[PDB]
Ligand binder design. Structure first.
Ligand code: S9D
Ligand code: S9D
Ligand code: CL
Ligand code: CL
Ligand code: CL
Ligand code: CL
Ligand code: MN
Length: 340
């Protein structure tokens, strides 16, 4: 039967089921005020599916010049055409290969560039902004979005949205690599999974995705979403409470020193965006510092709400197109104030 909401993460994560129900705020508000992330399912059913396909981005925008990142070693592939990324998104035989001959795992960097999404893609911009959940919080002029209403004593977010495009990590060695490394934002954000590409035939890798889920931190009900095989899984997130950010910096300073990095005692390993917490590091964080996080699998059409100040990292299971909007809720405005 259809219901308003359910729980994941053993009751610690709210999952809203109807992205457009006008009463969602009544359930959302208390979880948000406590500094928890929230998940909203079903946003893909509200969107124009033909606007969000890899082949359409390649046809319309393929002659633009871009840089790519090699996820495995952080090497920059400079000044290539954006079609060279899009045409290998799902079809592994058409995908760029390393010198050694393996298909690469690539991220498309800063595309569309800066604040240019609205100008470059006006029909995509309208389809996303009109269908965002919790619209009093997430729309540019929502009543509970302070972004347009604050003075210069507050860091204000850039005009959005921002698109995040990257291939899935493939091998057992790739399990310890991030798509986006551990970092935090001083604004709130909503991140929507608009497309998942699952390769078939030549370079399929379904067995290592299921291993990664079965051997990892995820709760039994999320494992009972993977195994049902009704919905496409896109990306594995880990999110930590804003109150635990300094304990995480203490662990990463200790691990940087153990690995022979030579860092001043004040340096900020979260701002550096250089670390991915693998299973070994997540267990050390729990046992040595007493810090627990939220392990979240973002499926097609899931919207992840990330509280301001919360450290987070992302690991793509399959090839993903994500679209994110920043906002400034009253609950978390302290995180962007420039004094004390
Ligand atoms: C048609 C429509 N909806 C259902 O189930 C629901 C869905 C959403 C809710 C909301 C969400 C916020 N407050 N209650 C309650 C019941 N079933 C058939
Ligand atoms: C409706 C029905 N079926 C689909 O296809 C898929 C394809 C792959 C999965 C993954 C694989 C790993 N765990 N589940 C799930 C659903 N899509 C929409
Ligand atoms: Cl467009
Ligand atoms: Cl709302
Ligand atoms: Cl990164
Ligand atoms: Cl907070
Ligand atoms: Mn982020």
């Amino acid at each position: 039967s259809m219901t308003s909401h359910s729980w994941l993460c053993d009751g610690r994560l709210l999952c809203l089921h109807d992205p457009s129900n006008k009463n969602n705020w009544k359930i959302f508000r208390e979880c948000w005020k406590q500094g928890q992330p929230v998940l909203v399912s079903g946003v893909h059913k509200k969107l124009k599916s033909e606007l969000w396909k890899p082949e359409a981005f390649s046809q319309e925008f393929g002659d633009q010049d871009v840089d790519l990142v090699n996820c495995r070693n952080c090497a920059i592939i400079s000044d290539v055409k954006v079609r060279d990324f899009w045409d290998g998104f799902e079809i592994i035989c058409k995908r760029l290969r390393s010198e050694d001959g393996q298909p690469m795992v690539l991220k498309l960097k800063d595309w569309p560039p800066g604040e240019d999404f609205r100008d470059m893609m006006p029909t995509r911009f309208e389809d996303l902004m009109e269908n965002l959940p919790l619209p009093e919080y997430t729309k540019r002029d929502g009543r509970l979005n302070l972004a347009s209403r604050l003075p210069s004593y507050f860091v204000r977010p850039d005009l959005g949205p921002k698109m995040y495009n990257a291939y899935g990590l493939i091998t057992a060695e790739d399990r310890r690599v991030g798509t986006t490394n551990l970092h935090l934002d001083v604004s709130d954000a909503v991140n929507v999974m608009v497309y998942v590409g699952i390769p078939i035939g030549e370079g399929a890798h379904d067995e290592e995705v299921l291993k990664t889920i079965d051997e990892g931190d995820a709760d039994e009900v999320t494992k009972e979403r993977i195994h049902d095989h009704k919905e496409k899984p896109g990306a594995l997130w880990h999110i930590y409470a804003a109150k635990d950010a300094e304990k995480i910096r203490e662990l990463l300073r200790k691990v940087g020193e153990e690995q022979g990095q030579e860092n001043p005692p004040d340096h900020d390993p979260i701002h550096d965006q250089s670390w991915y917490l693998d299973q070994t590091l997540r267990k050390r964080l729990y046992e040595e510092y007493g810090v627990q996080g939220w392990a979240i699998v973002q499926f097609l059409g899931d919207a992840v709400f990330i509280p301001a100040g919360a450290p987070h990292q992302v690991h793509n299971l399959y090839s993903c197109i994500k679209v994110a909007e920043d906002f400034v809720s009253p609950e978390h405005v302290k995180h962007c104030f420039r004094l004390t």
